[PDB]
Design a binder for this molecule. Structure first.
Ligand SMILES: N[C@@H](CCC(=O)O)C(=O)O
Ligand SMILES: N[C@@H](CCC(=O)O)C(=O)O
Ligand SMILES: [Cl-]
Ligand SMILES: [Cl-]
Ligand code: NA
Ligand code: NA
Ligand code: NA
Lengths: 252, 253
């Protein structure tokens, strides 16, 4: 049968290029939690696949003026991919235009910052400007802030939007670097914070979770794969396999 | 000329669904309160439906009979189109999703252990390796089914014990499980969000260990229902607004 086209994005420890002196080709180039997940799905559901990194390097948001989506979300809308297997947040605005499986991981927005400071919450950031803060451009965190009517978060969006050329970044890795090299706090998904703080012992999560959401496999709206992938994820969960995969891929 | 009211099946479970305390007799939907009742009210305004709440006739969440293959509980009510929706702390599971549809989750949780304070018991593994302290779960719910189906060594040993002693250790409700913890040397396998509620109100009890699994509660619908995806959208919008968190804080030593 026809191999499914799978869009994804580089994001440690979900999807990475394998380290090797030997040049690698095709799907063999990739590893990570989401690649392990994809492999399990392919075996359970009986399909073959071809991984392609999303050409624009984006997760996906809707343009304010022209209404067009970008990123992995747009690839699915345009039927240029069959699945998006990535740390792709299931959100209200995305679910209106693409389908998602049920979640394979649950998480929420939180804050990455340096240790040792009196900053303890988003409210602490919102009331000041000396410590800058931001998020990945055209992802779910940015979109949460952009849409929020909660006073702390709407204040924070006004600031991010004002300073966007400096404080919105293209990737989580660029956000981490901004935290390490300037006085900056990064609004980041909590499962990623967990990974980063285990490896950067001067960094910490600030406060708790600001929201709650899950990562799901994306499909074009109406795809028959969406419900099949939900069943496969539920079966993996029941067996403990997703927890094992998390432990596989995830200070003094 | 109005649309038919949806029949919503549910089950008594504090603080999700309860009868209101009142000296005045109450009728119809006005009898009920709780997190799931507030959720249902929000869904009905978002989606534009009216409804009638009915407690599941057989008092069960739902499991499949291994001899005759029939389901029971709220799951069976949906299969048979005796209800339009199930709005309850109904776990989304692989075996249920094969026969009914669920919305995406409105709450995430996992199985853990409820026991009395003051003990060296620290995990399911510690319980499994002994028999002096009995343990069990709600009959014909998701926790029981997780154990019955598990191939993990600790949990399959637990199921063998629970099954052997089921007339004594499987119970009809979380409340009966709590009373067993309080009146005998018994540990109850219970969902974590319910443990959180119970231990905040009885300071003699505690959670033992962490979460054994991960799952969500979802609104159940019959397979193929058009309400499933609409309710998923309404849930995602409520979460994006922070309203589910506010509802949890309202209802929850
Ligand atoms: N995982 C996010 C990107 C990272 C973020 O927004 O914090 C998404 O699905 O858009
Ligand atoms: N909420 C569970 C019942 C309680 C339990 O099994 O622990 C269900 O959906 O079956
Ligand atoms: Cl009617
Ligand atoms: Cl779904
Ligand atoms: Na990237
Ligand atoms: Na959708
Ligand atoms: Na289903």
């Amino acid at each position: 049968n026809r191999s499914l086209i799978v869009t994804t994005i580089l994001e440690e420890p979900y999807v990475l290029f394998k380290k090797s002196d030997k040049p690698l080709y095709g799907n063999d180039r990739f590893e990570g939690y989401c690649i392990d997940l994809l492999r399990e799905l392919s075996t359970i559901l009986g399909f073959t696949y071809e991984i392609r990194l999303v050409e624009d390097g984006k997760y996906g948001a809707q343009d304010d003026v022209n209404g067009q989506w970008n990123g992995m979300v747009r690839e699915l809308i345009d039927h240029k991919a069959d699945l998006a297997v990535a740390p792709l947040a299931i959100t209200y605005v995305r679910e209106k235009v693409i389908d998602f499986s049920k979640p394979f991981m649950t998480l929420g927005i939180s804050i990455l910052y340096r240790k040792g400071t009196p900053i303890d919450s988003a409210d602490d950031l919102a009331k000041q400007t000396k410590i800058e803060y931001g998020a990945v451009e055209d992802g779910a965190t940015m979109t949460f802030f952009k849409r929020s009517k909660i006073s702390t978060y709407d204040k924070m969006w006004a600031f991010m939007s004002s300073r966007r050329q400096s404080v919105l970044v293209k990737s989580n890795e660029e956000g981490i670097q901004r935290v390490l090299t300037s006085d900056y706090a990064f609004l980041m998904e909590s499962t990623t914070i967990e990974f980063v703080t285990q490896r950067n012992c001067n960094l910490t999560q600030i406060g708790g979770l600001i929201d709650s959401k899950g990562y799901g496999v994306g499909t074009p709206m109406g795809s028959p794969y969406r419900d099949k992938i939900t069943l496969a994820i539920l079966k993996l969960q029941e067996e403990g396999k997703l927890h094992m995969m998390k432990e596989k891929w995830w200070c003094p």
